[PDB]
Coordinates of C-alpha atoms in Angstrom, one line a residue:
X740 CA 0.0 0.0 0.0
X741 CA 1.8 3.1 -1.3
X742 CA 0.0 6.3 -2.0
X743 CA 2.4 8.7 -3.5
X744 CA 1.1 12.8 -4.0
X745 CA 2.2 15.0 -6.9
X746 CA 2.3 18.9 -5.7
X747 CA 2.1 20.9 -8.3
X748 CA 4.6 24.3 -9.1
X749 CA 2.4 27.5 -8.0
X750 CA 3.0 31.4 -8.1
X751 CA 3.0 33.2 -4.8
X752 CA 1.6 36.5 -4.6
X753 CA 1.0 37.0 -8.9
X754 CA 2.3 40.5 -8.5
X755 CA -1.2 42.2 -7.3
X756 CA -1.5 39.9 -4.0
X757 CA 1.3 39.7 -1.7
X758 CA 0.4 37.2 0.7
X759 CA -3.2 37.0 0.0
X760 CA -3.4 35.2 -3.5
X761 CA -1.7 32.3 -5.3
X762 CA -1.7 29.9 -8.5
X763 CA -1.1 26.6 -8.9
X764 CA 0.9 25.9 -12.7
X765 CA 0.7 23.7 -15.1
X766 CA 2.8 23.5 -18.4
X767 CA 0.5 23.1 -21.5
X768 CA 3.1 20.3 -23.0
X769 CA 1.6 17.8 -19.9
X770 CA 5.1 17.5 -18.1
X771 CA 5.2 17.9 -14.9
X772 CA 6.4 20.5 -12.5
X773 CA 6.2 19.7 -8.8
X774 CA 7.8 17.4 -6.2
X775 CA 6.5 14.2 -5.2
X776 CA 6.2 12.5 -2.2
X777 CA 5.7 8.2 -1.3
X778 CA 4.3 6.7 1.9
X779 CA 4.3 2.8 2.6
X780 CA 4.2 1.3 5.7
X781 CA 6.8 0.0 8.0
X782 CA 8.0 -0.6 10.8
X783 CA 10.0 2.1 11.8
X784 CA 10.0 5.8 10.2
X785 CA 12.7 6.2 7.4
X786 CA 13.2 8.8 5.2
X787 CA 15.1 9.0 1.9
X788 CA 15.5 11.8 -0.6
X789 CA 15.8 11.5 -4.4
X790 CA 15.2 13.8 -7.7
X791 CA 17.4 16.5 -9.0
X792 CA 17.9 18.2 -6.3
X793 CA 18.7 16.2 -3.6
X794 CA 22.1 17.3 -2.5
X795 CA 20.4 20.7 -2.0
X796 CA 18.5 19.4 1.0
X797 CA 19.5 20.1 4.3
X798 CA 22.4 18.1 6.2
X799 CA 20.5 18.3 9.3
X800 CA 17.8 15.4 8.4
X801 CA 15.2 16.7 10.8
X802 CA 15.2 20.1 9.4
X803 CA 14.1 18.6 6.5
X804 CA 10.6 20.2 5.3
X805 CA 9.3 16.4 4.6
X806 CA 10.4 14.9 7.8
X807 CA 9.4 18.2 9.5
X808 CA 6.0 17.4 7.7
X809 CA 5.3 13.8 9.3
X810 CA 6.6 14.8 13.1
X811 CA 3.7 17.7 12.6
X812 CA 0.9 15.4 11.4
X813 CA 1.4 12.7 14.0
X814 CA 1.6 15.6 16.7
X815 CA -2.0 15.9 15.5
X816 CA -2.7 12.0 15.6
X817 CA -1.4 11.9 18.9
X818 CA 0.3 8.7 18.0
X819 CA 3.8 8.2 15.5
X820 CA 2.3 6.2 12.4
X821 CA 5.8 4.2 11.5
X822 CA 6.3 4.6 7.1
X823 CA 8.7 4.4 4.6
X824 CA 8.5 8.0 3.2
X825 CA 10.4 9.6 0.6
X826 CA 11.0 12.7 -1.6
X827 CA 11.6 13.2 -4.8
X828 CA 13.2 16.5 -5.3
X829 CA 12.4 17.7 -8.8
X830 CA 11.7 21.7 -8.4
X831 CA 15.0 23.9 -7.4
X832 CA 15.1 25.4 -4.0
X833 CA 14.7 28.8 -3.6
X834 CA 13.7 29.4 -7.1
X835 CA 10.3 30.7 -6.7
X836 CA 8.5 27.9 -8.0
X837 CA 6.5 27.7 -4.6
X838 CA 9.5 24.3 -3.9
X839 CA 9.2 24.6 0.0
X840 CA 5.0 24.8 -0.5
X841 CA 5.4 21.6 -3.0
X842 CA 7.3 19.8 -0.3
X843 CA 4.9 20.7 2.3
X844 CA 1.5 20.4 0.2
X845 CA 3.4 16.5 -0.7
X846 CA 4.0 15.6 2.2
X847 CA 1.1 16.6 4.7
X848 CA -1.9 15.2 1.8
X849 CA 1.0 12.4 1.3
X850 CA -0.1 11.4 5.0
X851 CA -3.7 12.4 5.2
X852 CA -4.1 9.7 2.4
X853 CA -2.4 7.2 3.3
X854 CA -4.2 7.3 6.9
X855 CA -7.6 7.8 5.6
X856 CA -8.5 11.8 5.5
X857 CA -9.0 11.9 9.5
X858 CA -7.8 15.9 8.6
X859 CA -10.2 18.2 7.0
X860 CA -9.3 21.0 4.3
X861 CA -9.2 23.8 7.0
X862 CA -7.0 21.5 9.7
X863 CA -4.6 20.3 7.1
X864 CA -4.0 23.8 5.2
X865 CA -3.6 25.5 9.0
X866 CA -0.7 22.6 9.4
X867 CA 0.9 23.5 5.4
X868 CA 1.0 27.5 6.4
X869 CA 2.3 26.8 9.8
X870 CA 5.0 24.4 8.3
X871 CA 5.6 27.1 5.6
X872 CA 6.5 29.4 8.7
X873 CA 9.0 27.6 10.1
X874 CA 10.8 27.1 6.5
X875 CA 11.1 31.3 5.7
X876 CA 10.2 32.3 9.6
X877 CA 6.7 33.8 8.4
X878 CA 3.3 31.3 8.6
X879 CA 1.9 32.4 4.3
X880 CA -1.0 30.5 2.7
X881 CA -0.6 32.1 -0.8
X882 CA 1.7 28.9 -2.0
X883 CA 0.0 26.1 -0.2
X884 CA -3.2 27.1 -0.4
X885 CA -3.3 26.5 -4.3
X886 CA -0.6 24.1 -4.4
X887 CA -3.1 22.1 -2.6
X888 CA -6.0 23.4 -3.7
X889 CA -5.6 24.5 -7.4
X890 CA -6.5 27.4 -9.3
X891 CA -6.2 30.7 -7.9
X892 CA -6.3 31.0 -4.2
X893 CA -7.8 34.2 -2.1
X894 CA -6.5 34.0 1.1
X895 CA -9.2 34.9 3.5
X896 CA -8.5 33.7 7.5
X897 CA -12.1 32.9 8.4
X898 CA -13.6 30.1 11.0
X899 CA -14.8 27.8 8.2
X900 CA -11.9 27.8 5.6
X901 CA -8.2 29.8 4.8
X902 CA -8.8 30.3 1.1
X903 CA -11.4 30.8 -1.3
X904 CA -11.6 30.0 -5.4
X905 CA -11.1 33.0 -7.6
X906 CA -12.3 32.9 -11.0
X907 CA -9.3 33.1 -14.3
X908 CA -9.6 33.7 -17.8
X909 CA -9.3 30.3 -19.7
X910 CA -7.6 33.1 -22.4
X911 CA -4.4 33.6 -20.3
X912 CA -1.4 31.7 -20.9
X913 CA 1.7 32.1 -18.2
X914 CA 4.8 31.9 -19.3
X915 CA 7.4 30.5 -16.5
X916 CA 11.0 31.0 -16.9
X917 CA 13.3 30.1 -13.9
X918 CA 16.9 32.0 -14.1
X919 CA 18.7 29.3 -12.8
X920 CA 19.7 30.8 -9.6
X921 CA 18.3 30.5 -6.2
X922 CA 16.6 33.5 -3.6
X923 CA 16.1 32.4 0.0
X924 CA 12.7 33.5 0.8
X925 CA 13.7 34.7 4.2
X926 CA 16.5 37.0 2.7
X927 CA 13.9 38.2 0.1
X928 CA 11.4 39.1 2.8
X929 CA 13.5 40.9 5.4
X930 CA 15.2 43.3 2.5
X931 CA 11.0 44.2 2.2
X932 CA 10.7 47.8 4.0
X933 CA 9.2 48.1 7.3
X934 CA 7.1 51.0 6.5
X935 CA 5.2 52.3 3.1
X936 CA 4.1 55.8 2.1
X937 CA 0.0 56.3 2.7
X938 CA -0.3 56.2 -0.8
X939 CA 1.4 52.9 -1.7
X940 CA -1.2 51.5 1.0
X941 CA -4.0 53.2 -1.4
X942 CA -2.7 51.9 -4.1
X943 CA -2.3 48.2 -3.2
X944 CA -5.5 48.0 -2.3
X945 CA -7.5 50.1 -5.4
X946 CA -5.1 47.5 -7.5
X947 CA -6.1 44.1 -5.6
X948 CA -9.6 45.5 -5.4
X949 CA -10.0 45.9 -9.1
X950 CA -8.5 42.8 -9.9
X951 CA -10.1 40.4 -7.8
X952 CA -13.5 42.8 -9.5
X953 CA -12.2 42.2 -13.0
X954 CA -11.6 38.4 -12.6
X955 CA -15.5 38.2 -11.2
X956 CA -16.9 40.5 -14.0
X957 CA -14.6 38.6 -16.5
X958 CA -12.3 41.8 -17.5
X959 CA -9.2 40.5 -18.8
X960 CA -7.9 43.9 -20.0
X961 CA -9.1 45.9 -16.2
X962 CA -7.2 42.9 -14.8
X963 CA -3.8 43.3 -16.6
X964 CA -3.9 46.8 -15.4
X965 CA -4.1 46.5 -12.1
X966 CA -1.3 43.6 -12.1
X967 CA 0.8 45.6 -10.3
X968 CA 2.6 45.0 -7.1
X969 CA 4.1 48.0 -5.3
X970 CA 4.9 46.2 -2.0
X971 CA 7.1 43.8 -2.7
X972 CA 8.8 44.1 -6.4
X973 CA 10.0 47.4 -6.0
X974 CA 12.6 46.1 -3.5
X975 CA 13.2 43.0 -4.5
X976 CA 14.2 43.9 -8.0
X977 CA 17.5 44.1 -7.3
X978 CA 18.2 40.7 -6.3
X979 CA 16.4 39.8 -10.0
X980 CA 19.5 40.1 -12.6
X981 CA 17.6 41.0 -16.2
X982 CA 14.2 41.5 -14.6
X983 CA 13.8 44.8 -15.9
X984 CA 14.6 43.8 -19.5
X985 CA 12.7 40.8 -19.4
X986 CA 9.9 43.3 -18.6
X987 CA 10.2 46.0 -21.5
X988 CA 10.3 43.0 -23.6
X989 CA 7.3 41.3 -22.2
X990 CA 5.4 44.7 -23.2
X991 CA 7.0 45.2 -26.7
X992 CA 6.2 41.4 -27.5
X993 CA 2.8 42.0 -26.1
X994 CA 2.6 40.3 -22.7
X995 CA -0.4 41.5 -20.7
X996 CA 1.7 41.5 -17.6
X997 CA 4.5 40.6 -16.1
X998 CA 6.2 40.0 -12.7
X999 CA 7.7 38.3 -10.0
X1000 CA 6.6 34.7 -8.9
X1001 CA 6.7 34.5 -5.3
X1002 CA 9.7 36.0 -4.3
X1003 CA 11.7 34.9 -7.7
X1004 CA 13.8 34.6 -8.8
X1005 CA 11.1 33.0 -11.3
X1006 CA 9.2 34.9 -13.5
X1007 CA 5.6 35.2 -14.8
X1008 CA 4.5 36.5 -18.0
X1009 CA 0.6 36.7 -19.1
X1010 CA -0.3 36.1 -22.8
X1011 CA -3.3 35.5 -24.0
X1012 CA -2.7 33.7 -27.4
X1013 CA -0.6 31.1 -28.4
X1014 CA 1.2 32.7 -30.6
X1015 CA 2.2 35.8 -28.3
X1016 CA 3.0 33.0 -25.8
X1017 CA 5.5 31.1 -28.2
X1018 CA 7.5 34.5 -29.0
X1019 CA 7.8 35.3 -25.1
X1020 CA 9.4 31.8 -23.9
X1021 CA 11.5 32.1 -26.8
X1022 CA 13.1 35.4 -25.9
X1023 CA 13.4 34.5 -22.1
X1024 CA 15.2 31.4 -22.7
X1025 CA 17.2 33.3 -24.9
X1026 CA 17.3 36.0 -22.5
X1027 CA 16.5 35.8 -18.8
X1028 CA 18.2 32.6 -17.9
X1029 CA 21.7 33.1 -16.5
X1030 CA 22.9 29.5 -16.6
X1031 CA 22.3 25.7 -18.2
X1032 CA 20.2 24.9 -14.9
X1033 CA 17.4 27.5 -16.2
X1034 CA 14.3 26.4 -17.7
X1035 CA 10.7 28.3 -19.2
X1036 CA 7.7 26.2 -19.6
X1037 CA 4.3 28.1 -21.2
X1038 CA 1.6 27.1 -18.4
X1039 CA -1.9 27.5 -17.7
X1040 CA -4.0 27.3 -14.3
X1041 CA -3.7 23.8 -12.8
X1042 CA -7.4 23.6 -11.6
X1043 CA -6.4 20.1 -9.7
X1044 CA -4.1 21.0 -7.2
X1045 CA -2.0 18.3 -5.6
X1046 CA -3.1 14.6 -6.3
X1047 CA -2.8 11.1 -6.1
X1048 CA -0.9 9.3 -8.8
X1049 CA -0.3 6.2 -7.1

């Protein structure tokens, strides 16, 4: 009895949210992008670590996210449940692929499965965001949340549920294109200000509020305008080599936005044809990757969310 999860590759913030709002990828082509996690029983717990990027785990086994993952849920069981678990380590760490929220989402629904969903959605997602807190020192739902759920996640802390669905354009087309270096998330959120002008506070919130209105009233145009992130890119620009190119591009080619994915040093770019699409990942593999590690895959919304593949 093995029940192995697939967690999907998702963008933090999408340069309008920061903190609040998140969306699970999927390249179009049908590969996939996301880490995997087995469980099978045994008799004691043993964890090994596979994939691409294994050697980029940590030496200290029990900071591992995975391990960290298993001593949380049966903290919640009350009981250790004795598996063979292990990771397969095929997003890079630190890239802004939402890889620490993959590893999390993996392992927690990993568990929950294999014991027979004694968690519900609002338990287990409080367990992923606290897990995620521990990883970059601040508790976020905007990976996990659609990661685990799919789509695009509104994070909303209510009694009954973290997050809530928010409605896409079948149109848009994201262009992904990792640089092929790495960004600590903590690093990239302590070089964040501690203090914003008024009117960057107005701002934020006219641009979230008209695009979470544009996405309900199906406004694709409205929506690519208020795309814009002044809390977060601003400052973390810097640590982006070729960002700002990449961007002038994106609007010369005909992108209908562009930014940050989580806290990079992955990019987004939104096209909405195929052909427009096809023109952009060609330019940033020509363009915005710094190394042979890189890699740009044209996505759309993964509406699934982390599963079971066996």
């Amino acid at each position: 009895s093995m029940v192995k999860i697939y967690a999907p590759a998702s963008i933090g913030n999408v340069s309008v949210g920061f903190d609040v709002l998140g969306a699970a990828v999927s390249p179009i082509d049908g590969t996939l992008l996301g880490d995997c996690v087995s469980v099978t029983a045994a008799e004691r717990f043993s964890l090994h670590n596979e994939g691409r990027f294994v050697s980029k785990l940590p030496d200290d086994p029990k900071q591992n996210i995975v391990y960290q993952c298993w001593e949380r849920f049966c903290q919640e069981m009350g009981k250790e449940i004795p598996v063979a678990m292990v990771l397969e380590k095929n997003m890079p760490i630190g890239s802004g692929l939402g890889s620490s929220a993959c590893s999390v989402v993996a392992g927690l629904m990993a568990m929950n499965e294999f014991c027979g969903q004694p968690l519900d959605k609002v338990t287990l997602l409080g367990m992923m965001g606290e897990l995620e807190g521990r990883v970059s020192g601040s508790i976020h739902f905007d990976n996990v949340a659609p990661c685990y759920l799919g789509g695009m996640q509104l994070i909303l802390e209510q009694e009954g549920y973290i997050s809530q669905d928010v409605p896409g354009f079948s149109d848009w087309l994201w262009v992904m294109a990792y640089p092929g270096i790495k960004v600590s998330t903590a690093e990239a959120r302590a070089i964040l200000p501690a203090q914003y002008r008024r009117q960057d506070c107005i701002t934020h919130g006219r641009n979230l509020a008209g695009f979470i209105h544009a996405c309900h009233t199906q406004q694709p145009d409205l929506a690519a305008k208020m795309m814009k992130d002044v809390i977060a890119e601003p400052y973390r620009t810097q640590l982006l080599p070729g960002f700002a190119a990449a961007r002038q591009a994106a609007q010369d080619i005909g992108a209908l936005a562009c930014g940050i994915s989580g806290s990079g040093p992955t990019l987004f770019a939104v096209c909405n044809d195929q052909a427009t699409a096809q023109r952009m990942a060609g330019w940033l593999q020509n363009h915005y990757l710094q190394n042979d590690e890189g890699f740009v895959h044209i996505c759309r919304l993964d509406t699934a969310g982390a599963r079971l593949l066996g």
